[model samples]
Target: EIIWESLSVDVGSQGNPGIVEYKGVDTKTGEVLFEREPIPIGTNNMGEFLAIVHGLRYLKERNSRKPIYSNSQTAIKWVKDKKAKSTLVRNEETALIWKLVDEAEEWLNTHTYETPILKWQTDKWGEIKADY
Candidate 1:
């Protein structure tokens, strides 16, 4: 049977040194499956996008083939709509993100049970609120 996946993000202050943590849990049982704190290249718009990209990498690392959810409409739009535009600061990061998405798409297409999806959530960080 195919499984479902979801993700949430909280963008930190710009140019402020911090970490971005992505956690994946089993929706049904609330059991934590995987988690990762990817290092940001910098604390700018690009940094946020980089956090998202690393989040994707985390999903791929788990061999997940389910829909992922995030509260970042910007990131979701950038991925879903081809013509979506992002700020200049995040342009390069967007490019790299698309690259990672493409790679993920290729992998998902080849794998029968590995269908990946991305979704947007309103209360992304409702449950967790710890120091980053």
Candidate 2:
């Protein structure tokens, strides 16, 4: 029912600060289903982790079993592993993100969800529904 996508660019790599943005969109309708305020300093992996786990929680609230698709293998693994493992530098800029990451990880640990997280075939499926 939804596909999640994120852009993790160097807001900090090589002293050139950048930002990250993520969202979940309707697979068929191309409507925004879920979104997060852009993080001024963040990594691609954490953004995807939050997007996937948070999107899954959104579905759980409505009891939606529609499959979620993402092109991030690391994110898929994080969801399956029920962990948001990252080595991104933790600081004031990312404090809230870390909290949310912990929240998502905790939710995954305590809850059992049946929604399927599938792969988004950008190679064949073309652009994802939620492209920035």
Candidate 3:
């Protein structure tokens, strides 16, 4: 049925003004599905949290049933809780990320996506396709 099962996501946070980048790909065909360009002080958890919902919405728009993959339990648990409970200071440094974090929380509250969100299993499968 041409399913896209391996929707792997990742983040690069490893700065005060660090680029908390996040991105995703359909590892089935190596298609870059979604990405979020990060900024000053939001951090990886915020990107990871937001990316999961973006992929969920991406599939729902097309009515695809493929599950999404991410390695951060921090991100996964936030979705399960329907929240982006980050403790980052809400100054201009974190302004945009807080915007998206509020977005995903609202998005999750409004939408009930059925596609399962599973761990990326990087230990067994190697680095996820979205290295960023």
The candidate that wins on TM-score is 3
Off by over 4 Å in 1: 1-5, 14-45, 81-84, 89-117, 123-132
Q: For model 3, what is the alpha-carbon lDDT of residue 81?
A: 96
lDDT against the true structure, per candidate, is 0.45, 0.71, 0.79
Candidate 1, residue 2: lDDT:
23
Ranking according to TM-score, highest score first? 3, 2, 1
State which candidate has the highest lDDT.
3
> Mind giving the per-residue lDDT tens digits that candidate 3 earns over 1-74?
22246577777786623668777787777777777665656777887888888888988998988888888899
Where model 3 places Cα greater than 4 Å from the true spot, the runs are: 1-4
RMSD of each: 6.6, 4.9, 2.8
Comparing 1 and 3 on lDDT, the stronger one: 3
Window of ten residues with lowest summed lDDT in model 3: 1-10
Q: TM-score of each candidate?
A: 0.42, 0.83, 0.88
Candidate 1 lDDT score at position 19: 36
Better of 2 and 3 by lDDT: 3
TM for candidate 3 is: 0.88
